[PDB]
Amino acid sequence: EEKYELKEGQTLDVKCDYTLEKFASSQKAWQIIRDGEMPKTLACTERPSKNSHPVQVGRIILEDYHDHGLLRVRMVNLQVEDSGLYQCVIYQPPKEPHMLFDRIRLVVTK
Amino acid sequence: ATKLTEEKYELKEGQTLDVKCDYTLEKFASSQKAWQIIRDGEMPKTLACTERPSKNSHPVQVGRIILEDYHDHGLLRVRMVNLQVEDSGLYQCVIYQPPKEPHMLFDRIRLVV
């Protein structure tokens, strides 16, 4: 329930920590939580996740810092319609993803 | 947990910003490293960098910026001395690794003077 208020054109830059010894090479994803608590994946790493390589999907950039146990997420050139609830997960189909810890709320205004 | 990449430093004119940027020693000890400012609509801009290769401990001084690369544990120390209001901004430590994009070390620094 951390909430970040940003303006159009700005960048959200966050770090999601995970247990290095368990999840460093696990595939990971950034999701928006839509109506009815229904997650939608907007960007994911490769399987296995590559250390450091920036993965850019649309305006989202993922960078997995294997040596520090965190996934960095950037949402660049923000738009009002990016506003919502987001989370990092460990992406492991065909099982349901493992939520890493928490969700955040992003609010983008003009 | 999920947190902002930046860490906020609120300081007064005349004081010194003194931060550490940890890195993986066995990968990056000799790599050239830099302190950059992140301005809106521009590429990150290096204000000071180590030599290539980076020397153990010897300070590099550019204006009021002091860089020190400690090879005992793999840590880049950055100071900005005699701080001015105009120093306020968003900064990062990076490791150069051409032809890849520079690799950012955590945490970014949100400086408010």
CATH number, position B18: 2.60.40.10
Q: Is the peptide bond before B44 cis (omega within 30 degrees of 0)?
A: no
CA B27 – CA B53 distance, rounded (Å): 13
- Both structure tokens of A54: 């920036």
Number of folded domains in chain A?
Answer: 1
Residues in chain A: 110
Instruction: Give the strands of the sheet with B103-112, arranged side by side.
Output: B6-10, B103-112, B89-95, B33-37, B45-49
d(CA B51, CA A97): 44
Chain A residues touching residue B90 (CB < 8 angstroms): none
Helices (H), chain B: 25-28
* Rg value, chain B, Cα: 14
| Residue B2, SS3 per DSSP | strand
State this model's resolution in angstroms. Answer: 1.5
Q: Would you tell me which residues 22-41 of chain B have a C-beta closer than 8 angstroms to some C-beta of chain A?
A: 22, 24, 27, 40
Chain A nearest C-alpha distance from B43 (Å): 13
Contact A92, A26 (CB under 8 A): yes
Taking an 8 Å cut-off on Cβ atoms, the answer to whether B3 and A13 are in contact is no
Experimental technique, in short, is X-ray
Tell me if residue A90 falls in helix, strand or coil.
strand
Range of the domain at B27: 1-113
Burial A44-81 (b: 16+ CB within 10 A, else e): bbeeebeebeebeeebbbbbbbbebbbbbbbbeebeee
Q: How far apart are CA A110 and CA B14, in angstroms?
A: 36
CA distance B16 to B44: 22
